[PDB]
Design a protein around this motif. Structure first.
Motif, PDB file in Angstrom:
ATOM      1  N   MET A 106      -3.343  -1.945   8.727  1.00 43.14           N
ATOM      2  CA  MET A 106      -2.486  -0.806   8.428  1.00 43.14           C
ATOM      3  C   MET A 106      -2.451  -0.577   6.924  1.00 43.14           C
ATOM      4  O   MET A 106      -2.380  -1.534   6.136  1.00 43.14           O
ATOM      5  N   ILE A 107      -2.504   0.691   6.533  1.00 42.70           N
ATOM      6  CA  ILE A 107      -2.417   1.080   5.132  1.00 42.70           C
ATOM      7  C   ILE A 107      -1.847   2.497   5.045  1.00 42.70           C
ATOM      8  O   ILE A 107      -2.177   3.365   5.866  1.00 42.70           O
ATOM      9  N   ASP A 108      -0.965   2.709   4.075  1.00 41.36           N
ATOM     10  CA  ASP A 108      -0.367   4.012   3.828  1.00 41.36           C
ATOM     11  C   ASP A 108      -0.399   4.327   2.343  1.00 41.36           C
ATOM     12  O   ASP A 108       0.641   4.364   1.687  1.00 41.36           O
ATOM     13  N   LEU A 109      -1.611   4.520   1.827  1.00 40.00           N
ATOM     14  CA  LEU A 109      -1.829   5.026   0.475  1.00 40.00           C
ATOM     15  C   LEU A 109      -1.485   6.503   0.464  1.00 40.00           C
ATOM     16  O   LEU A 109      -1.585   7.165   1.497  1.00 40.00           O
ATOM     17  N   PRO A 110      -1.094   7.043  -0.706  1.00 42.10           N
ATOM     18  CA  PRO A 110      -0.771   8.468  -0.766  1.00 42.10           C
ATOM     19  C   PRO A 110      -1.829   9.376  -0.128  1.00 42.10           C
ATOM     20  O   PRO A 110      -1.475  10.378   0.464  1.00 42.10           O
ATOM     21  N   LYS A 111      -3.105   9.011  -0.225  1.00 38.25           N
ATOM     22  CA  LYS A 111      -4.197   9.823   0.313  1.00 38.25           C
ATOM     23  C   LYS A 111      -4.950   9.164   1.473  1.00 38.25           C
ATOM     24  O   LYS A 111      -6.029   9.620   1.845  1.00 38.25           O
TER      25      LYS A 111
END
Ligand SMILES: Nc1ncnc2c1ncn2[C@@H]1O[C@H](COP(=O)(O)CP(=O)(O)OP(=O)(O)O)[C@@H](O)[C@H]1O
Ligand SMILES: COc1ccc(C(=O)CSc2nc3c(=O)[nH]c(N)nc3[nH]2)cc1
Ligand SMILES: [Mg+2]
Ligand SMILES: [Mg+2]
Length: 159
Positions: A106-111
């Motif tokens: 899981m990852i939630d970078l701005p882009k």
């Protein structure tokens, strides 16, 4: 050693089937990517902006040695190869390649959000995803795809 990832493909401009076919071939040609499973194609009513053409959508499983950002680059390069000129997120496109799942990471970078943060309420993703990945765990909800998928009459068998 390869990680198992899932991509969502869409097209709603021109010869949609041929563009998706080309996309799969191109994806399979990148060093570090092997296409390892292919869902059926569905014809789907456009979601969001509804004054645009009906989509063809599918999902593919890949085996990859690429990092998630390299994978993203390859997804975006594939769109360029299929002459995606429009960049309005809400608008139509010759090809769209979305990273749905990258192992159980899981990852939630701005882009960059993986798992794709909108996949769980999109029948045009979940139906073809369930076709190939019914028992795969979606790491945000921690539910199997088969426990997320739902009926949607706007999603029709095409091929
Ligand atoms: N899981 C993911 N897969 C692909 N792109 C993602 C992504 N999460 C975020 N993005 C961002 O979205 C950009 C691509 O834009 P678009 O493809 O035009 C949005 P879209 O596919 O129409 O909406 P959607 O991603 O909600 O389906 C990428 O440049 C990337 O920075
Ligand atoms: C405001 O509410 C929303 C805004 C945007 C969306 C999107 O899905 C992103 S644009 C888009 N992509 C596709 C697609 O691949 N297949 C289909 N069938 N429709 C699509 N629409 C959904 C809801
Ligand atoms: Mg996209
Ligand atoms: Mg998309």
């Amino acid at each position: 050693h390869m990680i198992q990832a899932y991509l969502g493909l869409g097209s709603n401009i021109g010869d949609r089937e041929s563009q998706l076919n080309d996309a799969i071939k191109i994806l399979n040609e990148y060093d570090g990517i092997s296409v390892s499973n292919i869902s059926p194609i569905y014809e789907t009513a456009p979601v969001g902006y509804t004054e645009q053409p009906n989509f063809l959508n599918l999902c593919v499983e890949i085996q990859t040695t690429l990092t998630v950002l390299q994978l993203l680059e390859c997804c975006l390069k594939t769109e360029e190869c299929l002459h995606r000129i429009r960049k309005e997120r809400w608008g139509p496109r010759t090809l769209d390649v979305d990273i749905l799942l990258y192992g159980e990471e899981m990852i939630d970078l701005p882009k960059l959000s993986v798992p794709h943060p909108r996949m769980n309420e999109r029948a045009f993703v979940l139906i073809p995803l369930n076709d190939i990945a019914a028992n795969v765990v979606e790491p945000r909800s921690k539910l199997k795809v088969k426990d997320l998928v739902f009926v949607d009459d706007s999603v029709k068998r095409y091929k």
